[PDB]
Amino acid sequence: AVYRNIQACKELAQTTRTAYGPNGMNKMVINHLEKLFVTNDAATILRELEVQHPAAKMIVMASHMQEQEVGDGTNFVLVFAGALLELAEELLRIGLSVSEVIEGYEIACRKAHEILPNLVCCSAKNLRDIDEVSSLLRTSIMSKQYGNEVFLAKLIAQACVSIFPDSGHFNVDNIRVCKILGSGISSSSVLHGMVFKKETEGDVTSVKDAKIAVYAEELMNFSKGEENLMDAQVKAIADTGANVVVTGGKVADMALHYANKYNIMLVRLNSKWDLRRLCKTVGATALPRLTPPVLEEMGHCDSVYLSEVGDTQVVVFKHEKEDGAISTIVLRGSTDNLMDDIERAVDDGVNTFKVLTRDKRLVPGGGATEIELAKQITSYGETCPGLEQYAIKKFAEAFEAIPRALAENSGVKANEVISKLYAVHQEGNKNVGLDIEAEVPAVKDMLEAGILDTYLGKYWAIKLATNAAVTVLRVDQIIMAKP
Amino acid sequence: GETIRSQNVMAAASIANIVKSSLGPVGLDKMLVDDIGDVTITNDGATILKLLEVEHPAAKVLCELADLQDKEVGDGTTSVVIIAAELLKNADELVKQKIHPTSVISGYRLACKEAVRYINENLIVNTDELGRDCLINAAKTSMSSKIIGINGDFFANMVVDAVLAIKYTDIRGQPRYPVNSVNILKAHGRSQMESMLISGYALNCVVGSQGMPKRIVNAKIACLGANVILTTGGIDDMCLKYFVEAGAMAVRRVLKRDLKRIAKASGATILSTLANLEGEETFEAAMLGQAEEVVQERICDDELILIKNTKARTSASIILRGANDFMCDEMERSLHDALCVVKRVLESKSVVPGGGAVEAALSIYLENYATSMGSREQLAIAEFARSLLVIPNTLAVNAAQDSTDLVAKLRAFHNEAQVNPERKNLKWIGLDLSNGKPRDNKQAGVFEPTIVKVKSLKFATEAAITILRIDDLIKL
Amino acid sequence: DSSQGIPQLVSNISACQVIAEAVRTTLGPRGMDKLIVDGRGKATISNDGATILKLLDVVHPAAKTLVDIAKSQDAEVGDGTTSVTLLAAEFLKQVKPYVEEGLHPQIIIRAFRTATQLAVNKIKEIAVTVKKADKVEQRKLLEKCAMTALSSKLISQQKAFFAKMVVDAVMMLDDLLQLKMIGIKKVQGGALEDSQLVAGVAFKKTFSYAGFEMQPKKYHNPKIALLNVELELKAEKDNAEIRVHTVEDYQAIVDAEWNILYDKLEKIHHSGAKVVSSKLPIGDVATQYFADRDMFCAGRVPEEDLKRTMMACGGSIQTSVNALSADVLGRCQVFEETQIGGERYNFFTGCPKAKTCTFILRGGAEQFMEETERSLHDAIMIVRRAIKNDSVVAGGGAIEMELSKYLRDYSRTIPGKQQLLIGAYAKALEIIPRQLCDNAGFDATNILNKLRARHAQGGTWYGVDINNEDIADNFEAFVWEPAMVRINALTAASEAACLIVSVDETIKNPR
């Protein structure tokens, strides 16, 4: 019952085999909440595509580890692992054992970790400039949202440069993205602090308060008593001194009058996820009752005011006296489906440089370093005696499936690409990757184009991918139990 | 009916898929399993249709399609079936778009009318015979796919010298070249550069007795005091001793084709018997030859009696010396078949560059001609052009290349020629079937006759009109 | 529930064809109607592409893609969704046999984005701006275009008289033209020549209660009260039901009930509302209150006309009479009850914010007045888009043929895989002028085959004549359409086809 596990993981790769690269195909994602989505992100497929075959889940948990400590290489987990087991079936057809093949991959993983630093050609300059971040973030824009290589390269760079001076404090949790209905990507902008699209309900312009609190005769008597009840609540807020009150629910017409009576800025936020962002930044939590005057659950902010950017009244929550490391990228888009696809490409770019906060090392992509890595591992496999030759030799051919995906997804023949990728590297022309062109099957230097991946990303992508192929091959039979 | 015509289209659609990959020099073969059980594998598409026996009335139209093309032209019959096969696939789509077959027939006949005109406006005349030579280049490309290419200009010049010395009109100022050609033989002269071209036919026989000489410069050649005697009936031992007394070089048991080639080379006529129904006469000065020199050359294990400088020969003889049996045998057929390439080009004098350039260049002119006629004839003439682009698209697969790329690079070069006649634009460009790229056929030498491309488009269009003229199905 | 590869794309290709076939015959002015029935049995007969797809509600996801793309068409242009979904699916049909030939779906996206950008550049090349051509007045040329929209209609005989009202109806508006501000009302009786144009706000006025020879209609500076309260004595919503144990108190129960209407109408006199345009009916007793108090009233009006009056006088619709003040009341110069068509009608003329108007339709049949409403509304659109966008092109399918000539002639000199893909993109653009012949009953074979022959000779503004079964110069025939419409429509079409071709697998979350 071993091949049934290989056929299970083989099918999971063929779905994301086409979503790889910039010319990859989109996916008709039907959400469980009676919603329709269209994208080409491989990470979102598995979240919705419920693969119940537990043999393939080991590859998914490896892809989930590709989200921790790194934010790229998800296709590497599914493609490289899926190609490893496809060729592993060719070995067992001859009559090889499972342990010798596992041990051969355990050795090849150590040989691959030593060749990758040799192929590190260039890296970042560590200047904290906008041209440095935008020029290198072109790799994150690839295969997540094509065509916006110019727009998002500078937009993402503007939010990270504000935090790079805070050495060792750059995080993806500090960059919260917002999206507003608009014409297109041209109306996008970048702002500091937390910016929310909802306008200010009150007529208060600016306030530097730190206290931010997030939340027939008888017929006319109780109707006016409610007006005294609401006034007593804003008076309770005035007793606390909170000039900025963030409302999670609905606001009465009389509350707008009392909010301006005591000079209290009143802001409404219907989105719960936007309210959760305030819990982790200023310290103010959302209380369920009608405005509890709890001075302990109020946050701390140096300045709060209303702004208008792109013809949209938006409230600003920045920190002038403190250091400040929060940035908000406000994108504009007419279609909510495609507008969210851009939101994911932004998170992919923020996390790419979050790993570059460590030792900055980059490797060219596009089939350049993967064949150079497969060319050197094959050299160790030819001279290394013993029965490990069949596993190490095929471990190099597993690296070939990735440029084969870049070839087929680009409409280019897969065999002609690898034949030319091996000829240029036989002559020593390193850093030569496949040129993205539907008509030109030729190749060129990717370093001259400005395509550079993360050295620290390929490490964990090759390790988690090979360890998953070991975990799936060690299990030769799946047996059900009833607790 | 709409479903009756669909069955005639799907019927003929499968006949072309059987001989689709069999066309071209790198075409795929197919098995011919007869009813007994014998399997036969062939590569040529013409014989496939001859033995392809499938019961369908719509399919037999394509069987007789090649029979008429086999007698007049005798080549390229497979490409005639593919053109008509794809035309009905598109013509049925017109009927699905509420188009009557009558309007499609008249549009196809005019698309065929202008197709012959645009071919005639892109013809080339017989040239490269005096003053200029690419016929070297025309024959050099004919032998590029073999090991003989190591010595290009050496063997390439022997092709031009062997095809030019065999000139003879013989009919009303026709001149073509006969089916008979130079006798190519092999030798073991320790090298390939020792291959020599002699402008005279050599007889592969022995001189008989050793006492007589192997050299004679006599004019009289008796073909049955002539010294060179030839007889297929056989000469007796006591009879040959009398020729030793006479001084003649007799040869007995000679083949009729070798004797007739000498009678044609020497200007003689084969004499069957001496007795003129009443007596006995040698027929002196009646059927004797006219030659200047006759000598036998020392050849390895098979001597050749070489005759040189006759009155009218139209023949030659080349000796292929080499190092090993493999080196000499492979260059025999590469030398005889590559010679047939230029032989037909120098004969049938009105030729045209082929190699996919004809059907591709015609797809541009007929496209614009559809937008000039109108009146329920545009979509018929417009789709006739798309049917012709399948021939270079088919060869794109047989050449193991991209199916869509080679056809398009070929059209863009011809389109620039129509925009303006400047020399910057590429004109008369084909496709290299051996490499899978564009290639200028005027410099490469990929020529074809005029009667091939013209009659193929007529027979393919006329047969498709017959299959589409059918509009009923009766079964008794 | 999952599937990918070549055959998965065919399911989306053949699925989009069914959506186009559902609205294939609705393109054009003489297109066929379609009938859709809801759960309540209400049958709606119409040929509007946006209303058909809004009620079909196809569960297939591929069909939902064309609906969202057409929804944007009303935002970027305003109308013409039938041309979007039809042209969006035609790209998918011609590329169907090429998907099975072994070609990748992504290669077609590089071709469509090439041809889409090439066509927009050619629209601006042939487009001609017509502002003061031959120094003919814009009011004169616009009427010549209005008669063309009403040609081959019910009022084709006296279309010269109707054209004066099409252009003048828009001239009374501000610089920003808007069709929602324009109302059209039908009046039973009268001939086609007896039609009129009202620059004010008029309503049906189905008020058939008593109160004749009273309520003086003429006012100089009246105050328009937009109420939503019923002013009937024994009103279904305003009533009283008290039970007491005293004989003399039962009289007071009718007094307190009598005070419900009396006190409510008293605030109307305190505010000074001389004209009351109410949604709910007004009883017979309240009609006499406005008569004795020197006021006018009129109920039984839909909510559509109250909003036209809200933005016309500059007031605001209020629910009750308590908040009735000058801040929500209206104002006009001339107000008078007319007897057009024998029925009584009211209209407010001379308001400061008179950004609306009303068209009175007359005729001996209700079905004739409905078709003229859409024919007249169609003539306003040609006059509307001609004013806002002065750069127009040869409409009526003339421009689709020039694009087919440019993109095809350009693709011929383009080596690579883009010749059959842009060539098929050009062959797909010929379907709009092919289907308008079918949607008008003409033989599309003789027109399209003869239409393409003129463009090869140099015809750039020759297209399909909806009236006669022949070819004519659509630019000289006042058959104009803007450039941005054809530009914004073609890009949305390729945006729909490229989004469908980019999708290769269908995924369904089991839940």
Ligand SMILES: Nc1ncnc2c1ncn2[C@@H]1O[C@H](COP(=O)(O)OP(=O)(O)O)[C@@H](O)[C@H]1O
């Ligand atoms: N235009 C391109 N040129 C060269 N390589 C590319 C291009 N687009 C994508 N790639 C390759 O595709 C890989 C995957 O990119 P990305 O989508 O960011 O990660 P993931 O596939 O895990 O989401 C990268 O390693 C990169 O080398």
